[model samples]
Structure formats: structure tokens, C-alpha cells
Target: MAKWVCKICGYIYDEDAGDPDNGISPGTKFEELPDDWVCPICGAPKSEFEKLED
Candidate 1:
């Protein structure tokens, strides 16, 4: 599994542990996130996120 980071707010999105707060289930990949998904902290769009190193 991999992780994604929100460049705007530094929020971390882990694929192995999905964001339950946003209704995202475990094992959900960054590419699988909905278009409407935004950074929980700063409300940044998906486009504002970037892949993080393991």
C-alpha cells in the first residue's frame, strides 16, 4: 500500500488505512478517491495532493 499527502495542508492519506472520517474504506488507493474528495484540514482538492514515499 501507499500514501498520499495533501500539499496544501500536509494531511496524510494512507491506502492501507483509509479515512473513515470521510467515508473512505481501507485499502482505497489514492487514484480511487472521488473527484469531490478534499483535504479534511484545508479543504484542498485532489489535484493539490501528491504521492508520498513509503
Candidate 2:
């Protein structure tokens, strides 16, 4: 699972620990999230996120 970072708000989205506040459960991958999913911290669109290098 890859980690993603929100460019707009610097929110880190970990695939191992999905965004529970946004109704995403653990183990959800960033690519598996709905297109409508936005950054929980700043509400940025998914396009604003970039995968982090492991």
C-alpha cells in the first residue's frame, strides 16, 4: 500500500490506516477511494494528492 500526501493541506493519507473520519476503513488504498473523496483536513480534491515514495 502506498501513502499519499495532500498538496493543498499537507494531509498524509496512509493506505494502511484509511481515513475513518471520511467513512474509509483501514486497509483502503488511495486508488480505491471514490473520486469524490477529498482531503479531510482541507477538502482538497483527489487530484491534489500525490503518492509518496517509499
Q: Candidate 1, residues 14-53: lDDT per residue as tens digits?
A: 8999888898999999899899988888999999988987
Cand. 2 Cα-lDDT: 0.92
Candidate 1's error at 17, in angstroms? 1.2
Global lDDT scores for all candidate models: 0.89, 0.92
Worst lDDT run of 10 residues, candidate 2, spans 1-10
Off by over 4 Å in 1: none
Clashes of each: 0, 0
lDDT of 2 by residue, 6-46 (tens): 99889999999998987999999988899999999999999
Relative to the true structure, candidate 1 reaches a TM of: 0.88
Candidate 2 lDDT for residue 43: 91
